[PDB]
């Protein structure tokens, strides 16, 4: 479980848009430093830039 440190606006049809503070579960790293993530906050799933999140405490 990770937390968003920034907002992120989707730039592709498979990205996940998220707000700062959202809690995310990492599904896989099938896009490299782009991770497939599921937002516990919104229920959506999509790719995120891994440098925009950090582990939940």
């Amino acid at each position: 479980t990770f937390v968003a440190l920034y907002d992120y606006v989707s730039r592709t049809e498979t990205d996940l848009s998220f707000k700062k503070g959202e809690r995310l579960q990492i599904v896989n790293n099938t896009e490299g430093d782009w991770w497939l993530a599921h937002s516990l906050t919104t229920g959506r799933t999509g790719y995120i830039p891994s440098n925009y999140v950090a582990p939940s405490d």
Binding site: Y6, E31, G32, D33, P49, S50, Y52
Partner: peptide, 7 residues
């Protein structure tokens, strides 16, 4: 914000 990684 930091730069987006290459995809």
């Amino acid at each position: 914000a930091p730069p987006l990684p290459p995809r």
